[PDB]
Amino acid sequence: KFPFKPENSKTTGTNAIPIVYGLSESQPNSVGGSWWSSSYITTTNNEQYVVLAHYLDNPVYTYFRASTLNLETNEYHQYVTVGSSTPNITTLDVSVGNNGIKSESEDNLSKLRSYSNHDNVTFDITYDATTGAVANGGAGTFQFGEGLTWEFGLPSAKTEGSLTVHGEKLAIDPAKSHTWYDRQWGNTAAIPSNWTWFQLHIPSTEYKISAWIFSDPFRNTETRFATIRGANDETLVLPLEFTPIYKRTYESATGRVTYPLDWKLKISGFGDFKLSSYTEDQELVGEDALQTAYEGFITFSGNVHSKPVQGYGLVEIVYSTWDV
Ligand SMILES: *[C@@H]1O[C@H](CO)[C@@H](O[C@@H]2O[C@H](CO)[C@@H](O[C@@H]3O[C@H](CO[C@H]4O[C@H](CO[C@H]5O[C@H](CO)[C@@H](O)[C@H](O)[C@@H]5O[C@H]5O[C@H](CO)[C@@H](O)[C@H](O)[C@@H]5O)[C@@H](O)[C@H](O[C@H]5O[C@H](CO)[C@@H](O)[C@H](O)[C@@H]5O)[C@@H]4O)[C@@H](O)[C@H](O)[C@@H]3O)[C@H](O)[C@H]2NC(C)=O)[C@H](O)[C@H]1NC(C)=O
Ligand SMILES: *[C@@H]1O[C@H](CO)[C@@H](O)[C@H](O)[C@H]1NC(C)=O
Ligand SMILES: [Mg+2]
Q: Is the CB of 30 under 6 A from ligand 2?
A: yes
Q: How far is the CA of 19 from the centre of ligand 2 (A)?
A: 24
Question: In this structure, are residues 251 and 261 in contact, taking their beta carbons and an 8 Å threshold?
Answer: no
Q: Is the CB of 85 under 6 A from ligand 2?
A: no
Chain Cα centroid distance, residue 193: 19
Write the CATH number for 228. Answer: 2.40.370.10
What is the atom index within ligand 2 of the atom nearest the CA of 32? 13
Q: Which of 90, 105, 99 is nearest to 26 (CA)?
A: 90
Question: In this structure, are residues 86 and 29 in contact, taking their beta carbons and an 8 Å threshold?
Answer: yes
Buried residues in 138-170 as b, exposed as e (16+ CB within 10 A): ebbbbebbbeebbbbbbbbbbbbbbbbbeeeeb
Strand partners, 217: none
Q: Is the CB of 98 under 6 A from ligand 2?
A: no
Strand partners, 301: 274, 310
Q: Which of 25, 88, 95 is nearest to 64 (CA)?
A: 95
In a domain, 168, yes or no: yes
In a domain, 279, yes or no: yes
Eight-state DSSP code of residue 26: G
The rounded distance, in Å, linking the Cα atoms of 108 and 129 is: 9
Residue nearest (by alpha carbon) to ligand 1 atom 68: 246
In a domain, 6, yes or no: no
Q: How far is the CA of 34 from the centre of ligand 3 (A)?
A: 12
In a domain, 240, yes or no: yes
Quote the number of domains for the chain: 1
In a domain, 10, yes or no: no
Range of the domain at 47: 26-319
Method: X-ray
Q: Could you say which ligand is closest to the alpha carbon of residue 259?
A: 1
Q: How far is the CA of 88 from the centre of ligand 2 (A)?
A: 6
In a domain, 226, yes or no: yes
In a domain, 275, yes or no: yes
The rounded distance, in Å, linking the Cα atoms of 296 and 282 is: 5
Q: Which of 273, 266, 267 is nearest to 299 (CA)?
A: 273
Return all residues near 73 (Cβ < 8 A) that are at least 6 apart: none
In a domain, 227, yes or no: yes
By DSSP bridging, strand 121-128 and strand 112-118 are antiparallel
The rounded distance, in Å, linking the Cα atoms of 318 and 186 is: 16
